Enzyme design. Structure first.
Site, PDB file in Angstrom:
ATOM      1  N   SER A  67       0.824  -1.075  -0.090  1.00 47.46           N
ATOM      2  CA  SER A  67      -0.154  -0.050   0.170  1.00 47.46           C
ATOM      3  C   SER A  67       0.752   1.372   0.176  1.00 47.46           C
ATOM      4  CB  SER A  67      -1.169  -0.028   1.072  1.00 47.46           C
ATOM      5  OG  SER A  67      -1.863  -1.078   1.304  1.00 47.46           O
ATOM      6  N   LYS A  70      -0.066   3.176  -3.037  1.00 46.99           N
ATOM      7  CA  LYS A  70      -1.109   4.273  -2.921  1.00 46.99           C
ATOM      8  C   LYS A  70      -0.585   5.739  -2.973  1.00 46.99           C
ATOM      9  CE  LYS A  70      -4.380   1.396  -0.865  1.00 46.99           C
ATOM     10  NZ  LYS A  70      -3.871  -0.051   0.185  1.00 46.99           N
ATOM     11  N   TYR A 153     -10.799   2.230   4.699  1.00 51.00           N
ATOM     12  CA  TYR A 153      -9.642   1.906   4.091  1.00 51.00           C
ATOM     13  C   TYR A 153      -9.804   0.986   3.443  1.00 51.00           C
ATOM     14  CZ  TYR A 153      -4.656   1.138   3.251  1.00 51.00           C
ATOM     15  OH  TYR A 153      -3.149   1.098   2.773  1.00 51.00           O
ATOM     16  N   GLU A 274      -0.757   9.989   4.674  1.00 54.15           N
ATOM     17  CA  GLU A 274      -1.448  10.481   5.998  1.00 54.15           C
ATOM     18  C   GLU A 274      -0.518  11.195   6.829  1.00 54.15           C
ATOM     19  OE1 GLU A 274      -2.618   6.415   7.482  1.00 54.15           O
ATOM     20  OE2 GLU A 274      -3.538   6.011   5.462  1.00 54.15           O
ATOM     21  N   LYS A 312       3.373   6.408   5.511  1.00 50.57           N
ATOM     22  CA  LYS A 312       2.576   5.327   4.837  1.00 50.57           C
ATOM     23  C   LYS A 312       3.016   4.006   5.118  1.00 50.57           C
ATOM     24  CE  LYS A 312      -1.116   4.168   2.589  1.00 50.57           C
ATOM     25  NZ  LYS A 312      -1.275   2.861   3.500  1.00 50.57           N
ATOM     26  N   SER A 315       1.998  -3.280   3.070  1.00 52.77           N
ATOM     27  CA  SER A 315       1.976  -4.640   3.396  1.00 52.77           C
ATOM     28  C   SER A 315       1.543  -5.578   2.162  1.00 52.77           C
ATOM     29  CB  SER A 315       1.508  -5.094   4.635  1.00 52.77           C
ATOM     30  OG  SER A 315       1.837  -4.068   5.697  1.00 52.77           O
TER      31      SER A 315
HETATM   32  N1  LIG Z   1      -7.421  -8.505   8.623  1.00 54.71           N
HETATM   33  C1  LIG Z   1      -7.127  -8.227   7.372  1.00 54.71           C
HETATM   34  N2  LIG Z   1      -5.824  -7.255   7.612  1.00 54.71           N
HETATM   35  C2  LIG Z   1      -5.389  -6.965   6.364  1.00 54.71           C
HETATM   36  C3  LIG Z   1      -5.913  -7.261   5.150  1.00 54.71           C
HETATM   37  N3  LIG Z   1      -5.344  -6.381   4.020  1.00 54.71           N
HETATM   38  C4  LIG Z   1      -4.234  -5.988   4.803  1.00 54.71           C
HETATM   39  N4  LIG Z   1      -4.245  -6.384   5.872  1.00 54.71           N
HETATM   40  C5  LIG Z   1      -3.197  -5.803   7.068  1.00 54.71           C
HETATM   41  O1  LIG Z   1      -3.763  -4.326   7.322  1.00 54.71           O
HETATM   42  C6  LIG Z   1      -2.251  -3.557   7.428  1.00 54.71           C
HETATM   43  C7  LIG Z   1      -2.222  -2.331   6.553  1.00 54.71           C
HETATM   44  O2  LIG Z   1      -1.864  -2.711   5.278  1.00 54.71           O
HETATM   45  P1  LIG Z   1      -0.939  -1.851   4.524  1.00 54.71           P
HETATM   46  O3  LIG Z   1      -1.486  -0.300   4.646  1.00 54.71           O
HETATM   47  O4  LIG Z   1       0.510  -1.678   5.101  1.00 54.71           O
HETATM   48  O5  LIG Z   1      -0.998  -2.393   3.113  1.00 54.71           O
HETATM   49  C8  LIG Z   1      -1.253  -4.620   7.516  1.00 54.71           C
HETATM   50  O6  LIG Z   1      -0.776  -5.128   8.916  1.00 54.71           O
HETATM   51  C9  LIG Z   1      -1.799  -5.565   6.610  1.00 54.71           C
HETATM   52  O7  LIG Z   1      -1.156  -6.981   6.653  1.00 54.71           O
HETATM   53  C10 LIG Z   1      -7.231  -7.875   4.947  1.00 54.71           C
HETATM   54  O8  LIG Z   1      -7.609  -8.276   4.097  1.00 54.71           O
HETATM   55  N5  LIG Z   1      -7.641  -8.270   6.432  1.00 54.71           N
END
Ligand SMILES: Nc1nc2c(ncn2[C@@H]2O[C@H](COP(=O)(O)O)[C@@H](O)[C@H]2O)c(=O)[nH]1
Length: 359
Positions: A67, A70, A153, A274, A312, A315
């Site tokens: 992400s 983004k 989000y 952010e 930001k 993951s």
């Molecule tokens: N429970 C859940 N967590 C998610 C999902 N997709 C991403 N995450 C988690 O949400 C957090 C934020 O994601 P990022 O903004 O870092 O891509 C990370 O810890 C990521 O693993 C999802 O579909 N379900």
């Protein structure tokens, strides 16, 4: 390595002190860290990028940044605003006639970009696996909340923003990103699609079971979470967000990504980025990046008034990334790991390092 000269960089002990416990605790195979201070980039590399080759991580190593993509998607979007190809208050269906007749008649481009369309989910339903099925999904989607009232989000949300933004500029997203935006940002080792020439530099991600993985193709993945980059290129992006760039339109677009739209607690939502008032407590930084803010719908509050930290997380199944920087203090940090380790760990360590850089 007893008897070898210790590295000369006086920032090495500061970074090491925060990063080495991180690698050990969450068993991270490799991390590339890049830090900005006083106009100079400092690279610190740890562990291995690919367990099959044994090759060590460097600042040339390509990581999935999830992400964090983004922020680049949002910059592309802002670039279309600057060029006059769209406005953030455009209804989404202005830029896609297949959307005419749906809820996206009454939802703005801006709301898509800031996950405030009205309850689009974090991910596409699994059955949505083609461009045709994607279009059907959006046309049948029922708004949960009124537009602008809540932050949820969502990859389908900013994904669609990126998509229509590239459509307003009459070019497919990936070529537009790789051929126009990224070179203007000085990011000549950043890709949506890693070409044959660069594959050897592409790390493997590693799952919780230590299986080698890379990101799966998914709808609007390019727009939502599909960039691969090095720590050096990502620090060039931080620098572009501080000192600017030579392309006049891109310059404006960068500034536009910083403008606040609304806040959730201490966090203010920009385009992609952010932001927080700086200095920012660890607790505030953790709160803004907490499960509550990431996973559930939060009411939109008034944005912070226009020093500031921008940040930001990113993951994927096998990677964990984080970027933060404070323009007013000329400091920033990029942390790229080939393991998806807790977001709280990323913020605490970055927190700590930036505080020592600020002096
Ligand atoms: N429970 C859940 N967590 C998610 C999902 N997709 C991403 N995450 C988690 O949400 C957090 C934020 O994601 P990022 O903004 O870092 O891509 C990370 O810890 C990521 O693993 C999802 O579909 N379900």
């Amino acid at each position: 390595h007893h008897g070898e000269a210790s590295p000369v960089d006086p920032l090495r002990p500061v970074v090491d002190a925060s990063i080495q416990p991180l690698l050990k605790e969450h068993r991270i195979p490799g991390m590339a860290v890049a830090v900005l201070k006083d106009g100079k980039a400092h690279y610190f590399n740890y562990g291995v990028a690919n367990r099959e080759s044994g090759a060590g991580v460097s600042e040339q190593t390509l990581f999935e940044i999830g992400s964090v993509s983004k922020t680049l998607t949002a910059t592309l979007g802002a670039y279309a605003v600057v060029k006059g190809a769209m406005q953030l208050d455009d209804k989404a269906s202005r830029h896609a006639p297949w959307l005419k007749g749906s809820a996206f008649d009454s939802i703005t481009m801006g709301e898509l970009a800031t996950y405030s369309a009205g309850g689009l989910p974090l991910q596409f339903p699994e059955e949505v696996d083609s461009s045709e099925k994607m279009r059907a999904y959006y046309r049948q989607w029922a708004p949960v909340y009124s537009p602008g009232s809540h932050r949820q989000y969502s990859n389908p949300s900013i994904g669609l923003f990126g998509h229509l933004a590239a459509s307003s500029l009459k070019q497919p997203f990936a070529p537009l990103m790789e051929q126009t935006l990224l070179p203007g940002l000085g990011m000549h080792h950043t890709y949506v699609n890693v070409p044959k020439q660069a594959m050897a530099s592409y790390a493997y991600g590693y799952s919780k079971e230590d299986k080698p993985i890379r990101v799966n193709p998914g709808m609007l993945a390019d727009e939502a979470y599909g960039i691969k980059t090095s720590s050096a290129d990502l620090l060039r992006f931080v620098k572009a967000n501080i000192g600017g760039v030579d392309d006049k339109a891109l310059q404006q677009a960068i500034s536009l990504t910083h403008q606040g739209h609304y806040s959730v607690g201490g966090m203010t939502q920009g385009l992609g980025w952010e932001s927080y008032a700086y200095p920012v407590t660890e607790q505030t930084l953790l709160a803004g990046n907490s499960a509550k803010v990431i996973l559930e719908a939060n009411p939109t509050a008034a944005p912070r008034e226009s020093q500031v930290l921008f940040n930001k997380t990113g993951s994927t199944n096998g990677f964990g990334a984080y970027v933060a920087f404070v323009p007013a203090r000329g400091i920033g940090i990029v942390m790229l790991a080939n393991r998806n380790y807790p977001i709280e760990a990323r913020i605490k360590a970055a927190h700590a390092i930036l505080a020592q850089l600020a002096g």
